[PDB]
Design a protein around this ligand. Structure first.
Ligand SMILES: *[C@@H]1O[C@H](CO)[C@@H](O)[C@H](O)[C@H]1NC(C)=O
Ligand SMILES: *[C@@H]1O[C@H](CO)[C@@H](O)[C@H](O)[C@H]1NC(C)=O
Ligand SMILES: *[C@@H]1O[C@H](CO)[C@@H](O)[C@H](O)[C@H]1NC(C)=O
Ligand SMILES: *[C@@H]1O[C@H](CO)[C@@H](O)[C@H](O)[C@H]1NC(C)=O
Ligand SMILES: [Ca+2]
Ligand SMILES: [Ca+2]
Ligand SMILES: [Ca+2]
Ligand SMILES: [Ca+2]
Lengths: 315, 4, 90, 322, 4, 322, 315, 91, 4, 4
């Protein structure tokens, strides 16, 4: 009957003005909003680029007192935390470095440090070997006590530990306000030849023995394969991890955005991507991996620390 | 994290 | 009538046809907006992170940063409107 | 009738669709220009990732000269021309160290101490005064104490002239020269020794001062031959502790006549009233201003006792170009 | 500078 | 023939006689000669009387200039060129009086007081301090106090700058300048009045001193507005007598901060131990040296408050003629 | 006969070998002495004349305090005896003078003074009018408290007394050790025009009223003619005495070696010859007169005082 | 005639000696008037000379001394025996 | 000085 | 003194 042509016009008239008219309505804006969002980014990158013509500079005065390591300085009177020149070897020009003279006893030579994502750690084997980043920043009074992000060269670290066995101490702070720490009585890496293999002894602290135990929230292989002790160093341009040797597809350094002592990847991943906020989904990571300043044993695989450092001290 |  | 109505019936199917193509075109657009959103979102976060790296690199320095993003609420609809794939039989 | 109305009504739902296909077409184009842009950004993403990989320039490190020598004089000989940071290395010096050289008229003055604004607490211990503290910069506008061991080893190499530059709060300058100034080793503490006061318009504070409080004042405020002392290591001639009372590291006798490492007071004139040590702990040089007037700027520099100098003129102003 |  | 042996006896005597004649001639010749000698001496008498008739030359009187004026400045204007003794005559001055003018760079400083060696006791009475005492000489190397009436009438004519020259025992010099310095008439005693302390490197002793004995010291040692007092005429703010205790004529308050008329002590440093007045009675200027250090040389001079001033350079050497 | 001629013989022999020969030996001896004596005096005056090429000088400091007369100074605080400047008239430059602030009350302005015969008083009318001599001598400390010989000008004295009547006081000391004094309540001399006539009133003292009574050891005229009151002043070059006016032979000033108020000569003759010793015969004087510092009334006509002064004071 | 010769002879010698007693007299006088005068000039030379003390750059004091000259003089003017004389042969 |  |  007539009510037979209706259900042929009661649908078409509706789809045309509902589903179709609607999807068009909605989509448009969504597409417009994007062009908007992107319009910002371009004037962003370009405003900065416009400025990155000239590099930044640090014109801060240099502290008289020096030593051969941050501890030597503390011993000589360096009691404030800032930048100083040290000279661990008589046959090697002195180099600037950030000394922590307030955390756990003091005399700590900062080897690595994250605080504001002001530097990029996705560097190659030579950059990591030679050292990259800013030791410190001018506080305005021309005294450099604001620590910047950096990684003193692995070689440098190596030499330091070969001259005298060190003890490392890791510090980290979440974006909420809390902060734990982890230390090892012994620290020392073999020479480049050995891929700067990592060897640490005796854990202690409230962070979680991620170096000798790995991500203790795992079972069997899943945990052991996240142990950093005994591992060599890797960079995006040099795979030495324990993740399938010949296979160029298994590169922890490629997937976790940083130069580290990966072993079938990690438990502790400082040097990673500096996500801002703390939490970051598995979908935001360039390779769907838990990259970024991660210290599993304390905040899981999907929390990037707001602060992370690695200090060295003899005893 | 560990790898598959 | 039995030929003007039947003929009306055809120009009726006619639209129904055009419709199915409207939907067919929209289904693909709905998928391409699912992609764009995903990359622009991504590329955004990737761009926020690289600009900071400039603070310890360039003389003067700016500073980007995220926003509201009632955008994701839009993707839910702008996409979930599966009302699209509603072809016609006969 | 409901049959003839399906004619136009429908005809409308068809005329409209045209737009919809003229719009679905629009959505496509935009989506592309977008996908085009999104790609243009991925590109702008790498140029940025890169240009921002380089790190800041340390302009201070950048201005530390490679030239060296026994002291700043040798540094001039071996090339040095402009005043600034150089690494010198005295005789028994075990590790060369950074110092500020004041190069003028072929003279390489190696600087020992300098007060300028009051940014550095000088109340420090024996190690601090022997290893050294304070700060160094491309311009002599920072405060420091080179370090007693460095001053020992330095004034040990050869004979040096010690010039002390004093500036009061009206930016008036005056000096004092002591020949063969030197410090004995830490074993003897760090005894202050000089052959004598050569000349100067500031006054001979190192030879004590008739403050007027007691006939014995000059004898008890002379620094010649005195041992060094810090707030935790008393080596004075006082029943109490001059260094701790005055919070400094100086060659205290029955205290002092010249106190270049005293507490910084802005304005010169200062009063005791505060804690309980009603004694002058400022930056004084009694042969010029008196105990309750702290100098504005101060500097102790060394120059080989075998030079020439003699060309400061002085007297009325005229001293000052730009 | 001195003392009583 | 004995009778003829006697004839030879007479004969011989005759001989003797002639011999005696020759002698008598020789005697008369002596007196003859004596007598001219005599009258020649009598001529040397009358002559010497004359040459030893003029009296000695007073070389001091001889060097007192005829030039005059209101003060030493006018004296310069009206001719005066070299420092020395001139007779000036202030306005209400009833009788002009002798003073030492220190003329330098066209400035005619009329000198009021000067301590130099300690040859003049300054413990004097009210008339002595008002009529004046001490000595004057062609060179400013004598000690005196011009006189309070003379200083009143002088600082009364016009406004004068008061410069106080202080020299310690190491021959170090320092001054202090007070503008509009003046003394009120004897009726008001001889109140010390000045507008204020202009400048100087000696210190502002007239404005009291924080001796440190009691928080009120500066207030009780300030001389501004103070009345003059001698050992027999008390006008201080003390229950006792500062002037008598300190044997002087000064503007004592609860005694003093600056005491230029105090007792002379050689060497600067001096102790009480002696009589019974365990108080500082020396020539002091507390803003420089302290109460138990008496200055070596002192001078208070006046110059019109309407003159240049600054012609002294300073800073360093090259400031000393003869 | 034989013993007759013999007589005159033996006798003649003695008068030769004794009364003649002897006399020659003696007289000859004496004449040599006189010769020698004159040799002494010859060069004793010779070397001295040489030394007088340059005059003596007094470089002594001048006392601040001053007045208009010695008494005014005493009033102002001049309590020691020495040299000071006084200014009796506002229209006359101040002049040095010796003030006696210790004898009889003090405030004495010395007008004349004898003490060591260091000055010559045989001067003329102008020398006496203008003042001649040395007021004082340096005691070594450059303070002139040693009185020298002098006579402030008669004119000066005159002016002083015309402004205010004075009282004189004479002081004298013999060579033995004693010393008297004489004073007069009033003293004043008329102007030069009047020959500076002397007028004094009321004697007192232990010396003898030689000015109003004259040499009281005389009779009638002999005494009166030795009165100095009312007499004019005389000099060797100006006779005003009372000794025969027209006769130029009668010049007391000529015979008594000094400028004084002679009247038929004198009773008191200060300003006379400074004989050294006290006594001096009438034969030693140039004109057989009693010249020299004589004060008859106390030591006769033949005794010259070792000290003699004349001080002036108002009251 | 030989004996009455020695007489005139012895007498002439006398008047010859008396001639001397005459010179000796005047000398005695001259001496007296001279012994004094030299003193007088000296006491005078003493006084006037002492006035230099306050007149010359340098002063040279002169004091007297011995008056044994007045004793010798006393004799040498009272030994007037020179007054002596003779006569012989007149009437 | 002062006379406390 | 007096005179004749
Ligand atoms: C390791 O991870 C895999 C996949 O996530 C899981 O199935 C397996 O149970 C884990 N290993 C252990 C301890 O069984
Ligand atoms: C200076 O240091 C002293 C002791 O080291 C301390 O008491 C004082 O608070 C410090 N104050 C300054 C000058 O910064
Ligand atoms: C100074 O004179 C005064 C007053 O006559 C006296 O009391 C004091 O003892 C004297 N002292 C000296 C050094 O002359
Ligand atoms: C005055 O003197 C003469 C001579 O000396 C004397 O004869 C005479 O008697 C005296 N006059 C008197 C008072 O008689
Ligand atoms: Ca691998
Ligand atoms: Ca001590
Ligand atoms: Ca009182
Ligand atoms: Ca006459």
């Amino acid at each position: 009957a007539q009510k037979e042509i209706e259900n042929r016009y009661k649908e078409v008239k509706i789809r045309i003005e509902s589903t179709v008219a609607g999807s068009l309505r909605s989509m448009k804006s969504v597409l417009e909003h994007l062009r908007a969002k992107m319009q910002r980014m371009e004037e962003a990158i370009k405003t900065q680029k416009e400025l990155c013509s000239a590099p930044c500079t640090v014109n801060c005065r240099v502290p008289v007192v020096s030593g051969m390591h941050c501890e030597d300085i503390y011993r000589n009177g360096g009691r404030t935390s800032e930048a100083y020149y040290i000279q661990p070897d008589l046959f090697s020009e002195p180099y600037k470095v950030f000394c922590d003279m307030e955390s756990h006893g003091g005399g700590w030579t900062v080897v690595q440090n994250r605080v504001d994502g002001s530097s990029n750690f996705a560097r190659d084997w030579n950059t990591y070997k030679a050292e990259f980043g800013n030791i410190a920043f001018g506080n305005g009074k021309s005294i450099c006590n604001i620590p910047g992000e950096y990684w003193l060269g692995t070689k440098t670290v190596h030499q330091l530990t070969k001259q005298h066995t060190q003890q490392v101490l890791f510090d980290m702070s979440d974006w909420e306000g809390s902060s734990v720490y982890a230390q090892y009585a012994s620290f020392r890496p073999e020479n480049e030849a050995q891929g700067y293999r990592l060897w640490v002894e005796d854990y202690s602290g409230n962070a979680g023995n991620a170096l000798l135990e790995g991500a203790t929230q795992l079972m069997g292989d899943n945990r052991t394969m996240t142990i950093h002790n005994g591992m060599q160093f890797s960079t995006f341009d040099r795979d030495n991890d324990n993740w399938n040797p010949g296979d160029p597809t298994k590169h922890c350094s490629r997937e976790d955005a940083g130069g580290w002592w990966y072993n079938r990847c990690h438990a502790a991943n400082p040097n990673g991507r500096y996500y801002w906020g703390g939490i970051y989904t598995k979908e935001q990571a360039d390779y769907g991996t838990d990259d970024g300043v991660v210290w599993m044993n304390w905040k899981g695989s999907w929390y990037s620390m707001r602060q992370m450092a690695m200090k060295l001290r003899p005893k | 994290g560990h790898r598959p | 009538y039995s030929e003007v109505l039947r003929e009306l019936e055809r120009r009726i199917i006619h639209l129904q046809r055009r419709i199915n193509m409207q939907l067919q075109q929209l289904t693909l657009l709905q998928h391409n907006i699912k992609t764009q959103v995903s990359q622009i979102l991504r590329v955004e976060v990737d761009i926020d992170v690289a600009l900071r790296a400039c603070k310890g690199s360039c003389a003067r320095y700016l500073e980007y940063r995220l926003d509201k993003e009632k955008n994701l609420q839009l993707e839910k609809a702008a996409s979930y409107i599966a009302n699209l794939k509603f072809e016609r039989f006969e | 009738k409901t049959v003839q109305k399906i004619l136009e009504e429908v005809r409308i739902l068809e005329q409209i669709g045209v737009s919809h296909d003229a719009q679905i077409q629009e959505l496509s184009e935009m989506w592309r220009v977008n996908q085009q842009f999104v790609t243009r950004l991925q590109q702008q993403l790498v140029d940025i990732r890169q240009t921002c990989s380089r790190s800041c320039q340390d302009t201070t490190a950048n201005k530390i000269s490679p030239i060296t020598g026994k002291d700043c004089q040798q540094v001039v000989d071996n090339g040095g021309k402009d005043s600034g940071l150089y690494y010198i290395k005295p005789l028994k010096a075990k590790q060369p160290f950074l110092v500020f050289c004041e190069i003028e008229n072929g003279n390489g003055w190696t600087v020992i101490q300098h007060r300028h604004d009051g940014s550095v607490n000088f109340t420090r211990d024996w190690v601090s005064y022997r290893e050294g503290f304070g700060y160094l910069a491309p311009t002599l506008t920072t405060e420091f104490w080179l370090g007693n061991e460095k001053i020992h080893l330095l004034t040990g190499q050869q004979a040096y002239r010690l010039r002390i530059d004093l500036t009061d709060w009206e930016n008036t300058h005056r000096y004092a020269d002591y020949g063969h100034f030197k410090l004995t080793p830490e074993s003897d503490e760090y005894r202050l020794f000089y052959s004598m006061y050569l000349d100067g318009d500031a006054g001979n504070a190192f030879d004590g001062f008739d403050f007027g409080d007691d006939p014995q004042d000059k004898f008890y405020t002379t620094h010649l031959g005195m041992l060094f002392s810090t707030p935790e290591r008393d080596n004075d001639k006082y029943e109490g502790s001059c260094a701790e009372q005055d919070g400094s590291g100086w060659w205290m006798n029955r205290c002092h006549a010249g106190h270049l490492n005293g507490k910084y007071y802005f304005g010169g004139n200062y009063r005791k009233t505060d804690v309980e040590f009603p004694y002058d702990d400022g930056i004084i040089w009694a042969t010029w201003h008196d105990r309750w007037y702290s100098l504005k700027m101060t500097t102790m520099k060394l120059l080989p006792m075998g030079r020439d100098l003699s060309g400061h003129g002085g007297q009325q102003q005229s001293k000052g170009n730009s």
